[PDB]
Design a protein around this motif. Sequence first.
Motif, PDB file in Angstrom:
ATOM      1  N   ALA A 158      44.137  58.460  -7.996  1.00 38.92           N
ATOM      2  CA  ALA A 158      43.954  57.882  -6.971  1.00 38.92           C
ATOM      3  C   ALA A 158      42.755  56.082  -7.540  1.00 38.92           C
ATOM      4  O   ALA A 158      42.138  56.268  -8.783  1.00 38.92           O
ATOM      5  N   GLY A 159      42.894  54.866  -7.617  1.00 38.12           N
ATOM      6  CA  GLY A 159      42.232  53.881  -8.624  1.00 38.12           C
ATOM      7  C   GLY A 159      42.940  53.380  -9.441  1.00 38.12           C
ATOM      8  O   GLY A 159      42.111  52.307  -9.940  1.00 38.12           O
ATOM      9  N   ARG A 189      47.046  52.101   1.859  1.00 41.34           N
ATOM     10  CA  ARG A 189      46.206  50.520   2.690  1.00 41.34           C
ATOM     11  C   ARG A 189      46.802  49.829   3.383  1.00 41.34           C
ATOM     12  O   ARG A 189      47.243  48.731   2.225  1.00 41.34           O
ATOM     13  N   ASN A 194      49.612  44.234   3.910  1.00 39.14           N
ATOM     14  CA  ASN A 194      49.437  42.880   3.946  1.00 39.14           C
ATOM     15  C   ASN A 194      49.906  41.784   2.918  1.00 39.14           C
ATOM     16  O   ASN A 194      50.284  40.912   3.421  1.00 39.14           O
ATOM     17  N   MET A 223      47.465  53.919   5.963  1.00 39.83           N
ATOM     18  CA  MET A 223      47.098  55.305   5.853  1.00 39.83           C
ATOM     19  C   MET A 223      46.623  56.181   7.114  1.00 39.83           C
ATOM     20  O   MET A 223      46.556  57.479   7.535  1.00 39.83           O
ATOM     21  N   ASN A 224      46.621  55.072   7.960  1.00 46.03           N
ATOM     22  CA  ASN A 224      46.172  55.927   9.074  1.00 46.03           C
ATOM     23  C   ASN A 224      46.661  55.947  10.340  1.00 46.03           C
ATOM     24  O   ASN A 224      47.081  56.802  11.368  1.00 46.03           O
ATOM     25  N   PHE A 425      42.877  40.719  -9.202  1.00 48.35           N
ATOM     26  CA  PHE A 425      41.741  41.453  -9.833  1.00 48.35           C
ATOM     27  C   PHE A 425      41.406  40.314 -11.084  1.00 48.35           C
ATOM     28  O   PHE A 425      39.874  39.727 -10.750  1.00 48.35           O
TER      29      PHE A 425
ATOM     30  N   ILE D 135      49.179  45.245  10.172  1.00 48.86           N
ATOM     31  CA  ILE D 135      49.429  44.680   9.237  1.00 48.86           C
ATOM     32  C   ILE D 135      50.029  43.315   9.766  1.00 48.86           C
ATOM     33  O   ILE D 135      49.566  42.226   8.879  1.00 48.86           O
ATOM     34  N   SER D 294      41.653  58.528   7.201  1.00 46.90           N
ATOM     35  CA  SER D 294      42.353  57.332   7.286  1.00 46.90           C
ATOM     36  C   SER D 294      41.580  57.306   8.351  1.00 46.90           C
ATOM     37  O   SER D 294      42.685  56.184   8.985  1.00 46.90           O
ATOM     38  N   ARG D 295      41.675  58.379   9.418  1.00 47.16           N
ATOM     39  CA  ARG D 295      41.730  58.174  10.684  1.00 47.16           C
ATOM     40  C   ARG D 295      39.925  56.945  10.714  1.00 47.16           C
ATOM     41  O   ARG D 295      40.120  55.317  11.019  1.00 47.16           O
ATOM     42  N   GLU D 298      41.410  53.316   7.651  1.00 48.28           N
ATOM     43  CA  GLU D 298      41.608  52.306   7.636  1.00 48.28           C
ATOM     44  C   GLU D 298      41.583  51.256   9.183  1.00 48.28           C
ATOM     45  O   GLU D 298      42.393  49.890   9.743  1.00 48.28           O
ATOM     46  N   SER D 335      41.078  56.535  -2.865  1.00 55.19           N
ATOM     47  CA  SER D 335      43.045  56.476  -2.684  1.00 55.19           C
ATOM     48  C   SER D 335      42.653  55.530  -1.614  1.00 55.19           C
ATOM     49  O   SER D 335      43.658  54.247  -1.158  1.00 55.19           O
ATOM     50  N   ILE D 336      41.764  55.549  -0.202  1.00 56.23           N
ATOM     51  CA  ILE D 336      41.643  54.328   0.829  1.00 56.23           C
ATOM     52  C   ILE D 336      41.933  53.036   0.303  1.00 56.23           C
ATOM     53  O   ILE D 336      42.091  52.412   0.469  1.00 56.23           O
ATOM     54  N   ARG D 364      39.184  44.403  -5.614  1.00 51.12           N
ATOM     55  CA  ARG D 364      40.490  43.941  -5.998  1.00 51.12           C
ATOM     56  C   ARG D 364      40.185  42.188  -6.062  1.00 51.12           C
ATOM     57  O   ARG D 364      40.742  41.426  -6.235  1.00 51.12           O
TER      58      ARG D 364
END
Lengths: 478, 177, 59, 501, 290, 53
Positions: A158-159, A189, A194, A223-224, A425, D135, D294-295, D298, D335-336, D364
């Motif tokens: 991850a990352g 994510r 988006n 993710m949700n 980035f 989205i 993620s609950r 997100e 990861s999130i 990012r």
Amino acid sequence: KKNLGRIAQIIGPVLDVAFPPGKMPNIYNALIVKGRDTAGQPMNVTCEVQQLLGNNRVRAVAMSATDGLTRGMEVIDTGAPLSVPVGGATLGRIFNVLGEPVDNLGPVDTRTTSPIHRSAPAFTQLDTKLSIFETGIKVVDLLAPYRRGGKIGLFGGAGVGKTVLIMELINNIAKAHGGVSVFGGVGERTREGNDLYMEMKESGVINEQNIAESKVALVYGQMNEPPGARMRVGLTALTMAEYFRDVNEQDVLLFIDNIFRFVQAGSEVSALLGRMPSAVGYQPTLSTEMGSLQERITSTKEGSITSIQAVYVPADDLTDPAPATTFAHLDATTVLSRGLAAKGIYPAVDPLDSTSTMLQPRIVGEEHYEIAQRVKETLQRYKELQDIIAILGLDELSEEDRLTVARARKIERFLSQPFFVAEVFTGSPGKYVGLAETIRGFQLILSGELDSLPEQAFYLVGNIDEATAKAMNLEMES
Amino acid sequence: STASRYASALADVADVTGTLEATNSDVEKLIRIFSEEPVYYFFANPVISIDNKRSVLDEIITTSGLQPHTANFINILIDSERINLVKEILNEFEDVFNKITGTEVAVVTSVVKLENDHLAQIAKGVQKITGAKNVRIKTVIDPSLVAGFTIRYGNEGSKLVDMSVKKQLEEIAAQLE
Amino acid sequence: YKNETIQFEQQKAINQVRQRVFQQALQGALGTLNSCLNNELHLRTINANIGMFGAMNEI
Amino acid sequence: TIRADEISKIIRERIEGYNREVKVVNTGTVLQVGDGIARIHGLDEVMAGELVEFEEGTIGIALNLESNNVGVVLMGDGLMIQEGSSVKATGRIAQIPVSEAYLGRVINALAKPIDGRGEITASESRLIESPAPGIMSRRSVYEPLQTGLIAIDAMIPVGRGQRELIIGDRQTGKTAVATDTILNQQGQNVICVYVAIGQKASSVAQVVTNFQERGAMEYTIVVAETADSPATLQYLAPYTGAALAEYFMYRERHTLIIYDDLSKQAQAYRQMSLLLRRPPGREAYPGDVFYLHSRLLERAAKLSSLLGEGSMTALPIVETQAGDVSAYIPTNVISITDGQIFLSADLFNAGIRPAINVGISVSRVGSAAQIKAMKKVAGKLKLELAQFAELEAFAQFASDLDKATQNQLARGQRLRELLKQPQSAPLTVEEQVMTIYTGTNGYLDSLELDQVRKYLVELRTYVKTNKPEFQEIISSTKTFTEEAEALLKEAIQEQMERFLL
Amino acid sequence: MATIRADEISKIIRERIEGYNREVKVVNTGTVLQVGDGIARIHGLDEVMAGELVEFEEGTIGIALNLESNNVGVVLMGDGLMIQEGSSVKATGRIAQIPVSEAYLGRVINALAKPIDGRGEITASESRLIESPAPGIMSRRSVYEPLQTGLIAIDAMIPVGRGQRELIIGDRQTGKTAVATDTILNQQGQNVICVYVAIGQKASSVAQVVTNFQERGAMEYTIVVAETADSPATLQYLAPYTGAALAEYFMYRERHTLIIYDDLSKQAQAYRQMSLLLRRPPGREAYPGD
Amino acid sequence: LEVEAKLAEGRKKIEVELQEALGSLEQQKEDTIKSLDSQISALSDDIVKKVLP
């Protein structure tokens, strides 16, 4: 008269449902609660009928969120695997995992809906050419030649910017491949989802005008998402991709991430299901599930399936049974290091750790695999040299040892090249580094032509000419 | 439950039989029979010779005169050692009877032992509210029922509906609100 | 902030004494409902909550 | 303070309108209670995820509409609750009340007052788990959330709506890293969520004391779970903060959340499903914790302008257990998170709080919300830090460091001095870009670098007095104008004489 | 019998009420009482001998896993979405037969002793037991023979033996099957019947080496045993026994013959999933002991 | 030094005055808790009467 079983028991997205004692629905039958919200009758519980429990009851994977679900609510079962709005209707449509538009575009034409619990392409039926696929990225061209028509994956922690390298891959291959493109954000994510939608628009891969002529489709489970929601989202993505690869018979550019997250979803789903979690957290079902995943991902003769996928290679455990189990079924896993990004290489693939089915002199060209084995063993010797280099330092090393060390150091530095979209980035506009200019750069580097050019000058330097100009800048810098 | 499954099968046997009432009578009689903790232990000890327990079982099947479907139900049951898991399935038979019936037992609980006419009105209103085929009224003259009543209804006694000091709880709430 | 705290203390005592006299009024009502003509007031309220039961029932 | 007067009015006025309304109250005999988990015999009307309430008032959300009982996550403890007490199935599903009205007040995790100021009304009743930012429903995080942490908010830009981990070791003022972000959150119209998840309530009280003396608690809301909470209260107060965030967030404001920490919450959910004997996974977390994350995670977005461009700038603390990046908590946590902000525990051992190990940190959107002021003020600083690491990689060899090596080495060593701040000192974005151009000017090389401490501060002071119009240039125009840079250079040489003085 | 007595209620406990003071035999048809995901608990079929196939009522070969008291756990060889609850699996009686001759040589056989290649049904009239017994030490001669690896380092270091039992431990893309492939090319002149067993490999890569073996003509000497990963772990775990049966057909046909089992570690995880699919007690990395 | 002297002195004096304010509101609300037991008895009648619908 489809069986409206009662909502028998509800814990997690596995709900039990009491079907009729005669009319129990199929294994992997879809279902739907009569359903509610507080706001009216949200009937949205489509469901994957997991296990025929019996006593007219059966445990099932509801494809949504489970709030308000009254024990005893009547789910009319579809009695059949879930069908999704497959085909070019999705081309343009960010499809939900439900087949609904996650774009909030118009509701797509339901003419091509498809049962995603579907057969796999036969060994008779599969195409069999070992064609490589062009990259534009340095080791992505070179070390693991990505094979045309195949599930090329990237296992990474991850990352990593598995996001990032996947998106630069998307940027290159998308404009490159005239084949139909299908991306599966899967547990993603969805901020970056988006970003991806904005980017498809920005590329015209969402040609927003002529949304049918977007020619690249989105399937997002964020993710949700719940895990049973996150379970067969890839199955639906594969189903529409199979419409592309069989119905359209188009070349299936097919990217998807994260399969390790898909495994984690299936793991927690079977944790809900009442089945003993076999591995560290993984379900026993994980094996044949990921096999069924890779098995629809067979490059068919009608449309070969260039299926780029990603493993969220967790905990940097390759021997995590997720990444272990993946390492078979993928055809070409780019193993992305965390460590080369601690060295700053974006992309940070341990090219030593990745491997190609396409890697052969007969396949890549003997010149390519020859110089490739040269650079590979340069890396291997460099890694072996790192051991004595660590405590003692290189003053105890030999001069051929220092020659090889700076040589493979130069190889590693020249392996660093920028990526095309990667600027957001960093800032660099990447070079779509072709295979032969890379071949000449490898020739100069391992041949020690570049052994007067500087290692730091080769860092994120695309061409050996671009390295030569960058070194000319550095040698100008005084 | 599988105890509830045993009850559901006993009710199914009595139902395709028609002996839902008859084996229900057998259920009450055998419930009072197995209510004997010595009889429940003697039938339910593992030390019991299930030969001698089957002997005493047919002896008790005489000694209350059980109907044949429920008799063979008990025979399979004690045969399958869920006699150890006996009694509540027996109890569940009651609900299974109501599951057969739709006669919903609802417990009222009032300051007084209320009017049987008021009981009729409440059972009728609960036959509409429940939508019930019938209503086994289960009364109670509750002491902490200040003046009003409390009808626990529903599948369980889940559907509580009470006006005794419940409105005083509401008044204390709106005070606290 | 101390003034805000003082008004918080004011509101605290407001709700405090409100709950105190609420409990007192409750005790008075409790002795009263105990003292009620049992079957009479209970039958008035019983047919009343029977009609209220039917009222929730048509709903 | 005379509540004696209108009490006859108000008490009867609440008894006025005492409707005591009548619906079919479903209920369960809590058959087998244990460890916040209920076998509730009954509550057959198990609308899943509805909050129900024991006869002791013990709240509980449905964890299992089971075929025998109903398994219920008894929120909080039922330590006084005997078996078989009636839980009224209250119907309202996880709908903690949210409004802006709870602001300035420490909330106990069950929306009770941990303030002790008393109760407060809230109009919305957000279900604690609702859908997350869609989205289309998101937009670009174009606006900033200028963090006030120096080379964070320059280098690793905290954006309005954004998401970034703050990994770091033992409470190091990692707390204070979040707090100094919150001092900046005074100046925005941003709702600040001081989610001190399960922290040291002593230190949390210190945090609230600092927040309220700082007064940005006006602009904030302190989410307070004591360390000795219910593990479910720990395991759900995230969702409470999510709802309270969604209030101001679906009130279209910029908003900002600060979770501290999900790691203790990860321990909590581990303990929770562990108490369920649900078989947990790698490193004894149960699996869905990431999904719980993620609950959690997100939600955050600079939402769509179609949604109203509401920013929810969540950024959590992320406990560095021994610097183990492959903690399954951290492994998910990266990861999130679209940004990952790894702290400097060695520089914490160097006391150099604000201590950020900037290479291992990542975000990012580094300049998409960092201003043209900030980006054209500090891109040189970014590469100056990178080359400071480069000429800081292995400077133990050459033994006479040339002005190339040594001047970049002391320029970047000066940068190592330069990002350092006293804690809770949210400097101005003006002062941020000011010190950015200062280091870009390099003029403080001749500071024996502790000189730069007073020097940069008094330089900000002399541009504060003298050319505050240049602060208006650097903020209003917010592009690094050579008028603003001109006045900065003028005041820079001016304070250079004045600190030479 | 917490599982059985629940779904017994509708029929089998109604049958138990029906046949209480009565001792009966439903001992052929396991009405598929409980069933999950290739694993069934079929009530009845008690006289099904252990190891038998079970002709599922929809049409599927339930593999005999464990005889519980009321129902029995059975392993579905196939995709049992077809079977409904209480489906009377007849006991198919043939306990792990194997259509066995030399007929599958020159054909990529599927795990069902059917051709995966589409070269039609190998007319393999014998029935070697799939779960075969083993070669006794008295039944063994010493391996006097040398086998031709062709890998001169291998046959230099470790002597390849006709009859012998070597295992290749490797790495993720060792490409270790290619070493096996050239061994088959070495075996292509060696008068040895050749088997290319393939558990869960990339069926793409399986076809790649299959084309390479066909082009090699070691696929003349070889049959290809094939069960890719998406198939049943019934097939995946079990298929090694099937290759052993074909081998013992060639080996009780006395030939020099050699087999190439592509990873049984895949089959190890497959039977691990079988064990947890039995919901049995598993162990080290969820393996059973057995 | 002297400005911070008089300023911390101002902190202490405003603290003492606010302490007086808080103790005075304490006595005020305590007296109010003692005050209007008559209004409390008006409520004692009122919630009993409004109690019985």
